[PDB]
Amino acid sequence: MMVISEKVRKALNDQLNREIYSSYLYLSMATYFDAEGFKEFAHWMKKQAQEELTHAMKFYEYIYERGGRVELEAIEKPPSNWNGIKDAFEAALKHEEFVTQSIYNILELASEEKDHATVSFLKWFVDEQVEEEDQVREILDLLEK
Amino acid sequence: MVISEKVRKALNDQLNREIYSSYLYLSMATYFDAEGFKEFAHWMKKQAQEELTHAMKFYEYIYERGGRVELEAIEKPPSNWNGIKDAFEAALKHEEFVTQSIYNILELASEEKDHATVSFLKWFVDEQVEEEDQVREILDLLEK
Ligand SMILES: [Fe+3]
Ligand SMILES: [Fe+3]
Ligand SMILES: [Fe+3]
Ligand SMILES: [Fe+3]
Ligand SMILES: [Zn+2]
Ligand SMILES: [Zn+2]
Ligand SMILES: [Zn+2]
Ligand SMILES: [Zn+2]
Ligand SMILES: [Zn+2]
Structure with missing residues (x-):
């Protein structure tokens, strides 16, 4: 049984997908930084990308702990x-x-x-x-500076 | 109280640890400020503030579970x-x-x-x- 509203589930599913896009976006920043030679800026971006995926999995788990289901959506192409x-x-x-x-x-x-x-x-x-x-x-x- | 006394003592002990952490970072701000590294000092200030909110999250959780907080002496940080x-x-x-x-x-x-x-x-x-x-x-x- 789901003990959240279908509208809070939808809202949280939408936020899960935003965290995935966030992840992808920060991975795309690393591709830029890495191409322009800023390997330390790329390294931060890759750390950030990993951390946004842990944000998305906390939403994932919360939704399922309250009886909801998660549906993944298309992820738009980030700027390069x-x-x-x-x-x-x-x-x-x-x-x-x-x-x-x-x-x-x-x-x-x-x-x-x-x-x-x-x-x-x-x-x-x-x-x-x-x-x-x-x-x-x-x-x-x-x-x- | 709906936490065990052992968990209560452990969380109260972590609370005082987070308070000391805050004080330590503030003391790092006094070193960096004295030596002219104003941006490191600012980071240490924000971290001291953050550690205090860590401490107050343990505070509020201990009371929400029916415990009491007890504040201990705070040791002198290096400077x-x-x-x-x-x-x-x-x-x-x-x-x-x-x-x-x-x-x-x-x-x-x-x-x-x-x-x-x-x-x-x-x-x-x-x-x-x-x-x-x-x-x-x-x-x-x-x-580097
Ligand atoms: Fe996030
Ligand atoms: Fe973020
Ligand atoms: Fe802390
Ligand atoms: Fe800390
Ligand atoms: Zn690095
Ligand atoms: Zn954080
Ligand atoms: Zn973070
Ligand atoms: Zn600053
Ligand atoms: Zn932090």
Whole structure:
């Protein structure tokens, strides 16, 4: 029996697929960095790509622990190229801000439905999102030289 | 109280460990600030803040399970290191000890089939893995 709403399941399935695309996007940044010779920037991107896949599997597991099912969707082709380093890290920041808004939106939905388990789940992700935007913002400040 | 007293003592002990961690990172900010590395100092400040929210997550979980928190004395952190690398190496050694301490609480709660504590702790095991790897990445970039 599923003890989440079909609309919170759908929302969480949508976020799982965003984390996979996030993963793919950061892998694509590594292909750029690696081609332009920045092997340490590529290495971070590959770490990030792995970590976004662990985010997606926590949603995967949560959905199944509450009796839902996961359906995987097509993943769009990510950009392969940026107009230099700053451009690449700004795209990353902009994508993380979009990811955060998307989780905040699910957090509003699950509150209106008084789903306390899902609320508790997403608060861990909010905190990680605040950390990840500030990591990228910090990179961007250091690049300003 | 719906946690065992052993798990309660272990989580209260980790809480005081996270408080000391915060204090340690703040002390690293005083070294970096004194030596003119303003950006390392800022990172250490944000980490001290973060460690405090780690501490307060253990706080709130202990009370949600019916326990009480008890604050212990906080030891005087070092305030000086041999150089930049020596400082981040102490940060790594310290995050490794925090990871082992947390893993041991995880082992204990799994023996006692305390699934809420296991679930609570797994967030921190993943955060400790990421933070250890952050220190490691900074160290490798220094060797350049
Ligand atoms: Fe993510
Ligand atoms: Fe992310
Ligand atoms: Fe911590
Ligand atoms: Fe830590
Ligand atoms: Zn590296
Ligand atoms: Zn994190
Ligand atoms: Zn992260
Ligand atoms: Zn800074
Ligand atoms: Zn952290």
